[PDB]
């Protein structure tokens, strides 16, 4: 018997096999969840990444900036899940920020056009997705998004930090809307993870300062932190997807090795 036995969950944000969403999807399927996966612009290549998952899963096209995609998403999911069946979970693992708003680039030199695009994708889309999917969610359901603790400023992450701050605020309002359906809405604030996205930033002064953040994180974390292992994060997301945190919503769960509770 698995944690998510007989639950229908939509997982978005799977770009590579190193994406956090892939490990969330992997662990979810290991725990008995029936999945619906979304992607964009490389569905042939994405499906082949998806094929490495334990179980087969339908793949739907979703650009969270496309209003037509969002307006038809709910229906397209139903034609895949089956009529009379609803979703029990939605995982939002989508974030983006142009180079000008991250890395070694001066914080002031990021034009708003780039920042607005990042915030649309990283923060506003969380509400867009909730708006589209809540009608086809069962009571007791769970919406989960991804987060990186933005309560304090930091190097390199720059404007992505701001987009995460907005996301945290958006989540609290999504929770108000989700409550009417009996649905919870939460974020998982993870410690630093070596996704291909972040791995690129490290290589592409800033990269050294990222290493300083990574090193300091593991030391600070009372139980340690492995940036190469996304599994503890994925299990945390699955925990929120289950029925074992049923009184938690509009909230943030920190899967960071306990680093945010330690100063030094
Ligand atoms: C899920 C996709 S996402 O786009 O929306 N996203 N959300 C959560 C999230 C959580 C942790 C992350 O890892 C880091 C690292 C990693 N170092 O190895 C370094 C820094 C810093 F501050 F040093 F630059 C920040 C986050 C990345 C992401 B994220 O921005 O990819």
Numbering used by the authors: 5 to 208, 213 to 272
What are the paper's exact sentences on this?
The frontline antitubercular drug isoniazid (INH) targets the mycobacterial enoyl-ACP reductase, InhA.
To further understand the inhibition mechanism of AN12855, a co-crystal structure of InhA-AN12855 was obtained in the absence of NAD+ to 2.65 Å. (ii) The diazaborine head adopts the negatively charged tetrahedral form interacting with the catalytic residues Tyr158 and Lys165 through hydrogen bonds and charge–charge interactions. (iii) Similar to AN3438, the oxime group of AN12855 forms a hydrogen bond with Glu219 and stabilizes the salt bridge interactions between Arg195 and Glu219. The large increase in IC90 values observed with mutations at Arg195 and Glu219 are consistent with disruptions in the formation of hydrogen bonds between AN12855 and InhA. (iv) The CF3-substituted aryloxy group fully occupies the deep substrate site tightly packing with hydrophobic residues Tyr158, Ile215, Leu218, Ala157, Met119, and Phe149. Resistance to AN12855 in strains with InhAI215S is consistent with disruptions in this substrate-binding site. The Kd of AN12855 for InhA was 77 nM in both the presence and absence of NAD+. In conclusion, both the ITC and crystal structure of diazaborine AN12855 revealed a novel inhibition mechanism that is independent of the cofactor NAD+.
